[PDB]
């Protein structure tokens, strides 16, 4: 049994039937008061006397919100090791399997990391950074907040939360040496698991769509976009690439523009640009449609 | 100026060299990316301290005929020179790992990405070690991933160079 936190313990259990559930104490956080009683979130009336309560944790019964009696609360969760691996249950992964989606709009510092829930009840969540070596980029996130927009996979739709993260801002660098490594712990009810990411910067890039698409007729018209405000600056160091198509990176039928303008033939047609890193791989921006005259 | 050319065409045959690794180099953790991120030149370079352009230098306490004549900076002239430095760095390093690959089939390393590394190399100027072949094969790929890195690194301050 370890403390995540003053008044809420996690309890690893093997999570095989013959396996015993550990056995360990505890007791009211009163420490003079006697003649006391225990109560459960999951039990309907009393069932401890002493001031200290022992408890066997072999299955999610045997845990909740253990409360004096309303003297103190103590809270139990369980993280599940089956075959010597840990439980991924509250969490959905996405069709990557990934179960942190990772991106940054620009080299700012700034990105959010995203995640599918599979049941959203009793959810608390806690993002930081897993490294505390020396050499180690920190990062500081803020509170995960529900999305009101849900996200659909496998013929089934799931909810999603978020958070911002921001690393703290040293003195610059051209490249990303070490990765930034980060861990959410998840907290169904009576349930705890928790998840790890790697990532770098360069790799999380995700441009925002470009703006102000303009078009002008020619002898055959010039379509014209500008880049994302979010995107970092100089432009000129941070040079973004774009594809354009007639009607992520899916460039179906669609062809590269290297500069803010191109000339494309289209009667009736709607004219959509993309943008992306002029130089890495990365993630490409969403679509940005604009009908043709 | 000019060297922006040779950053371009030196970013092409990197990228379409790592293609030809994750390709035939299948099932190797070279198109898994769990490879660890190896910069070799780790130890002697300063280019990701000097590297940047001068915008982002906000704060105090932070030759080739590639730098424009109109606008001359120490530190990009410690950029460029760095450059040079990496590019001798894994010209060597390439070329003892072409000799064991040459040896023994699946892989071959582009002359024109070692071509374009040395093109690059004389704009901006005006003892390997030890592996079998599973190993070998392995440390191509660690080094590519690295080097096209590097190269975007190179290609965005050309690009500040040119244009500004
Ligand atoms: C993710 O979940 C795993 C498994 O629940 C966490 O590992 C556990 O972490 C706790 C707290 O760091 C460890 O408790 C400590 O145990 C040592 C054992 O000597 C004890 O001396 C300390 O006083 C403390 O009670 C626990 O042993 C450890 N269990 C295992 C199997 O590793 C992990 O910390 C969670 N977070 C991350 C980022 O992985
Ligand atoms: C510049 O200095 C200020 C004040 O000490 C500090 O808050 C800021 O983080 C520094 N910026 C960089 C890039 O080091």
């Not at chain 2, 953790?29 to 590297?51: M, P, V, Y």
Request: hydrophobic share 30%.
């Amino acid at each position: 049994m370890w403390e995540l936190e003053k008044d809420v313990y996690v309890v690893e259990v093997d999570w095989t039937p013959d396996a015993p559930g550990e056995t360990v104490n505890l007791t009211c956080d009163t420490p003079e008061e006697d003649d006391i009683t225990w109560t459960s979130d999951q039990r309907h009336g009393v069932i401890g006397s002493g001031k200290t309560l022992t408890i066997t944790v072999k299955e999610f019964l045997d845990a909740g919100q253990y409360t004096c009696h309303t003297l103190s609360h103590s809270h139990l969760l369980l993280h599940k090791k089956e075959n010597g691996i840990w439980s991924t249950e509250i969490l959905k992964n996405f069709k990557n399997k990934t179960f942190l989606k990772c991106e940054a709009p620009n080299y700012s510092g700034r990105f959010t990391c995203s995640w599918l829930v599979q049941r959203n009840m009793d959810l608390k969540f806690n993002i930081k950074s897993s490294s505390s070596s020396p050499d180690s980029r920190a990062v500081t996130c803020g509170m995960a907040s529900l999305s009101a927009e849900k996200v659909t996979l496998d013929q089934r739709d799931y909810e999603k939360y978020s958070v911002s993260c921001q690393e703290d801002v040293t003195c610059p660098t051209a490249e990303e040496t070490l990765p930034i490594e980060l861990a959410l712990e998840a907290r169904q009810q009576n349930k705890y698991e928790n998840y790890s990411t790697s990532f770098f910067i360069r790799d999380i890039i995700k441009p925002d769509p470009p703006k102000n698409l303009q078009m002008k007729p020619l002898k055959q018209v010039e379509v014209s976009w500008e880049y994302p405000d979010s995107w970092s600056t100089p432009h000129s160091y941070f040079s973004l690439k774009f594809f354009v198509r007639i009607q992520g990176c899916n460039q179906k039928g669609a062809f590269l523009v290297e500069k803010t303008s191109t000339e494309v033939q289209c009667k009736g047609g709607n004219v959509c640009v993309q943008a992306q890193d002029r130089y890495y791989n990365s993630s490409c921006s969403k679509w940005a449609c604009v009908p043709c005259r | 100026a000019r060297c922006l050319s040779q950053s371009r065409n030196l970013l092409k045959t990197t990228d379409d060299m790592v293609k030809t690794a994750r390709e035939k180099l299948k099932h190797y953790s070279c198109t898994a990316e769990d490879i660890d991120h190896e910069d070799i030149t780790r130890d002697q370079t300063s280019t990701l301290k000097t590297c940047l352009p001068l915008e982002l230098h906000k704060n105090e306490s932070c030759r080739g005929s590639c730098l424009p004549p109109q606008k001359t900076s120490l530190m990009m002239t410690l950029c460029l020179g760095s450059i040079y430095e990496d590019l001798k760095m894994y010209q060597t390093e390439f070329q003892a790992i072409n000799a064991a690959l040459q040896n023994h089939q699946q892989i071959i390393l582009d002359k024109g990405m070692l071509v374009a590394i040395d093109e690059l190399m004389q704009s901006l100027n005006h003892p390997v070690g030890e592996a079998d072949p599973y190993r070998v094969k392995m440390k191509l790929c660690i080094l590519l991933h690295a080097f096209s890195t590097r190269v975007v690194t190179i290609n965005r301050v050309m690009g500040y160079l040119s244009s500004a």
